[PDB]
Design a protein around this ligand. Sequence first.
Ligand SMILES: [Zn+2]
Lengths: 150, 67, 153, 242, 177, 121, 286, 378
Amino acid sequence: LTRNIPQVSSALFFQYNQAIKPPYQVLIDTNFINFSIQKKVDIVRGMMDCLLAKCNPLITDCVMAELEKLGPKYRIALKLARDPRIKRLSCSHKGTYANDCLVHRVLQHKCYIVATNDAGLKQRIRKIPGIPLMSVGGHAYVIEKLPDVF
Amino acid sequence: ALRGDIALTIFDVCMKTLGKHYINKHKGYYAISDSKMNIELNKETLNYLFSESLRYIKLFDEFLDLE
Amino acid sequence: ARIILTMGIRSKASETDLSEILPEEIEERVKTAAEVSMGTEITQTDLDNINALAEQIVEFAAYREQLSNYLSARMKAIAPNLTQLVGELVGARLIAHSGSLISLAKSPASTIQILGAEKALFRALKTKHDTPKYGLLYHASLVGQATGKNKGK
Amino acid sequence: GARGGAKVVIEPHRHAGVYIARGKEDLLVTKNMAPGESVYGEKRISVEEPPPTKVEYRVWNPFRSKLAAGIMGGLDELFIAPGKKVLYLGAASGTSVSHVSDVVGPEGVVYAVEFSHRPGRELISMAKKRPNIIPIIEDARHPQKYRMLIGMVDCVFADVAQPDQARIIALNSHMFLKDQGGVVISIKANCIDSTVDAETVFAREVQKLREERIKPLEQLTLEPYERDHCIVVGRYMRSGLK
Amino acid sequence: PLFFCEGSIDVVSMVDDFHFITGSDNGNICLWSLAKKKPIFTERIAHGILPEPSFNDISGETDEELRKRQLQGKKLLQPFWITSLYAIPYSNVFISGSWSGSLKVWKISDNLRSFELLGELSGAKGVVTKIQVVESGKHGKEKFRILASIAKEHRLGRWIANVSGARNGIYSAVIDQ
Amino acid sequence: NPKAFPLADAALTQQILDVVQQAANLRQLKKGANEATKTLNRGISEFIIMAADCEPIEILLHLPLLCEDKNVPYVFVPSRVALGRACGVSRPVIAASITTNDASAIKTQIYAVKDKIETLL
Amino acid sequence: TREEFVSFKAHYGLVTGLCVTQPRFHDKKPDLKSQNFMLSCSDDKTVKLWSINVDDYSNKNNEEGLIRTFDGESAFQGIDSHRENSTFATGGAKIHLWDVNRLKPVSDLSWGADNITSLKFNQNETDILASTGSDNSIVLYDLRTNSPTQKIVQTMRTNAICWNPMEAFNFVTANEDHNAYYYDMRNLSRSLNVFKDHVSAVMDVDFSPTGDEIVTGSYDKSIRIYKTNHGHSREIYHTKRMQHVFQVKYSMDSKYIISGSDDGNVRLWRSKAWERSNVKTTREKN
Amino acid sequence: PIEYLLFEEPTGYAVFKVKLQQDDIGSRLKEVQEQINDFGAFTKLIELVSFAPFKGAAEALENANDISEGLVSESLKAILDLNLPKASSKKKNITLAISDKNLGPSIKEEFPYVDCISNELAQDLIRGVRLHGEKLFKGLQSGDLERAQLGLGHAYSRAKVKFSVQKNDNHIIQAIALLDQLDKDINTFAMRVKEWYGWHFPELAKLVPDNYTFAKLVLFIKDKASLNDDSLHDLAAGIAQRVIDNARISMGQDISETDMENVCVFAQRVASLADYRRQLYDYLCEKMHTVAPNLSELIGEVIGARLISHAGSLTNLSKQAASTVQILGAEKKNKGRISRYLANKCSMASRIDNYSEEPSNVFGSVLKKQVEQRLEFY
RNA sequence: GGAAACUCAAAGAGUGCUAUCGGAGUGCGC
Ligand SMILES: [Zn+2]
């Protein structure tokens, strides 16, 4: 009888997560792009101004499907998120739901940082241990649990 | 002009090609490398090749009517 | 042993084989196997050394045949009643297990029955099980003729 | 502990083919295909069976074999069953391919490829002993020049040490692996990228797999035996990826 | 045109208070000023190149073409080291030494920026571990005495590589005029 | 096609053997053929170096079959006496090895050397 | 494999029209079984002709992009390539006719000084062509006479014209009033059909190469498939994530329509929305 | 346009006419790429139209080498010249779905009217015919694919390695592991000859203790009736007189006959076994001199064969370190440092004569001189 | 309570099995 308890991924400390070297990989998602636009900050230069390090953004196919699905009010968001500076993942699961796609994607790798803004996703991300989220705030970004913010 | 040079050329190509392919029917995958074995298999293919050439002489002497 | 004594090397296997050995349907298999084989080649030194090995190992088999025929004839000479009843290759194991012929004759019918499987006998006695019934006589020619528990009786 | 002469029970494991050897301290043990000769110097259990016959078993030293550490750390399912055909990208020498061979058994085959030469002659000198393996001494980056001699393997496995790991396994699996078939790769982080660290390079490699149509399903890290490698198990979908 | 990088700088002498000479490992012998980080004149391989290991003691094989192809051509030829270098103080000529047997005495030119092979003394088979010069005479005529210490081991480690006929001694040469 | 194929040229020779001398002064080096193969089949070996002019060449040619099986780079050097002078020892050592240690201050030069010789091979 | 061969930053402004050619040069053999040629005109006065390396075959073993650049006086609005003898026509301020051995336009073929929104050549009787200009006008031209030949004026501006690859004298015409007209050429007084089911501007149409189905794609976020012989919609595709389909094309297999939205994607669709693509057994096909 | 396909197989070359076509645009769909997997639809798509088997094993290896470097050969060019039609220039040129772009230009060079193609359509069509394998060929062969590909793989691997098949240590392994067991078997069966001939002549185990000359004189004297011929016993063996008068004074005797005849058969066959030992030991002496001469000269021939047998193979002995050549019994303070010296010199000689291509004796001799100087240091 | 499946019926899974006027001539097609 096969039980399955996932081991704590061995590039993690107690909660320090030494696998997050300063060239970062972030996970952009949908209402974070929308709030970045309606707070009028940029994306790559905004992340650089918040983290003082070179950040590579990533968007998944599930989040791109959500951004296409949300209609023509966010054509600015879609034109911004088809940026050649960002990269793109490729998901393989059923149901384009950004929340469980994101939190599954990060809890089986523990190396991405999650750039989110909605309440349930922030709650699940800060529930699971040792991955940093960032969010919009005022006219800049804000990091929640990176060990070296400065 | 139209002598048996056709039959003689195809006899020559028969001799060298049947010798080579009898050697490659033996020595299956690995070219066997010892002096007396190579020499004795060359004697074996000389024996089989001349056993073919004597059959050529036999059912040509039955044919002859020519040069 | 006879096919290594006949072939020698695998290269000579295409133009010859005996038909007194490997009857009529393993012949083309061993010829195509010697055609497409994956082992290497050996020279005449180790060839004739393993040839002499094949000589000794075919002489062992012919001598074993001659010696078992000798054992049949000699048991028929010494104790012809027992080998007329049971069989020579069972009476020989009986006598040579019990030692002397006299010290096998001085033994009851029950232990002549169970003379072989005594270890299953004694572990079945010292635990609580049921003792066996054939032992060494099971390879005789008649308890194989019987069927069921008729071989026990 | 586990000296030569103790009596060890041989219990079967979940992955059919391998066995647990439970003594006073446990071992992982595969049933030897050619009895009587160890291949890289490992210890051998030797059981007797009843005409008395005697069959032997080899231990599986996880500090010197790759997938043994994944087996002992506990993978959900491999694809190396006792009947399948198994391709082995980056077969170094006998030291793991003999274990995969005698897991596979006398019916299935193991096609072991290798690029270097001196491990190639060691692999061939081992390969003459047991018959269920095929040694190939060709580069794993060119699966169109040993396409002549293999066909339609049922699970591939990968230990090659090159930074085009995903391209190697993608080309070999498109050329040879059947649909709904397994692919077990073993990434070495410090080998394929020295700059960025282990979890980032693992996520980049598994993203390259799910771009090359292998749907991954297991990631194990095998940390107490080797450092910073990982075993990534995947299926080859090709039809209905999601 | 077969040359190679510098391995080690080994021995020195000050010709004057504004130049000096270094005899390196790889056969380079270098005249330096006190003004430049670069050397002025780096003469190449000093005493020649060592003779290669022969075609019978390189690979233990039998066939001569295999034991000659294991020499890999000239690609493992190694230079004679400068074992000891010594200049006569405030003069033109300096003396080197190796286990090539021959004390090669160069001479610098009057513009103090080059030197050429003046002479070669083929008298001391062995490693030349240090070289001294003691002179006599008058203001005009000078009778110099090149002493050198000659051994069968280098003065730091053992490192005997192809030494033949080399006994522990003192090499004297009474050069004149 | 000789038996000592990855033979290093001059500048790469000089940088790998000053890394050798730094390792010998940092107590991170194993000197000699049989200690080299012992640390090689123990596993702690960043890379191993042989000398391509030992008078039997096979007494260190046995090291390729171990090292390229256990996936560790290996380099021939054209002088055993220069490698002895590099290791800082009287007699000429012909086969050196650098142990693995993440508490040693030549990790950067070791990795630069290892990348250069993996590109060389 | 649904992937891209190469990309190009082709121009600066809006790209306007591209088509592919097998362009027969005269000082060069047509190497059209190893590399494939496409050319594209934009509104920054350039018409670039490009090669593409393509592994359709494996004959050979390098001249990747930008074979040449025709440059024009005014802007450019569309092209299409005459499929014989390596000639191609463009539209802009007035329609021009180039071939790929000249940097200058070989001919100029307008009625008056009026811009031309789109063009199309035939699929047979190749030497004639049609175009549409923002005088709400359909023009025809004939290169054999090297002149325009007739001109009708509709009530709204024709966006995209498309010839029939089996009739050779019928074309469809997609204009901003919400109905694709279907004209016969040699009697241009009566639009012999009108396909009349949209709600917004009819942005593009194309014939299937089987010669009887029309794909159309509207300015409203929907595409429709018509038959020729009916005049109403057979059926309709739409999705939530496409907006303002601007270009639809049948594929040459005549089963797959390639639609391209304004969101960025180039989606594909089965024309028959229920016929699958596997080869089927004979009782199933029956 | 894919209408002919070429597949290469380890029994022969196959060429398939493509009856109908695959869906090109939807060629990533599930309902298309399961048709390659199932069989009832693949034979709707590909039929066999030619299959020429190369029949020579070496010609199969040569075809495999020419394909593996990407070059045409005689049988491939022969079947393409047979099967591929001359597509005349009015229609088209014929197309051929081959497996690799390295092979492509070498058939386009030879046949002008063919045109090779390998996109993913040719890739997965060849993948489908590789998956279905034998069930396409509908019986046009004699022999399955896997044993033939096993042989062809081993041959191709050895031809790539150019592995020296004269460096044979397995012969010495089996030689010494047969030799010691055969000495034990000769000794046991000679004890049986002694214990069986004791019933006929029990004062022979005292006089003639050697097993081989015991068996040979048991072959000489059948029954105790010799009594006169003294001039043959020094040949077959002074003690002649002892065995002659003990052939009449002893008479601890059973007079049995047929068992004496089988004793004679057994004794002459055990003598044959002794002759076989006395030649096999000399055989592996000279084979030790041929295969491993430096270690032979250093340590001795049978001690060397014992040491390679303990190691398992000569390559395994060489890749052992020089401190783990500790073996008990062999290499027989001042009694231990000489054995350590002999140990790592034996490992040095093992490295020389294994990793050489074919070894010499000069390094074994100078190794012998070095260790003898180290012994005379005492 | 153990079930002989060889009395028969209703059903469920796994495995294997197939294709889509007659010869010339005569105006003739490359
Ligand atoms: Zn997703």
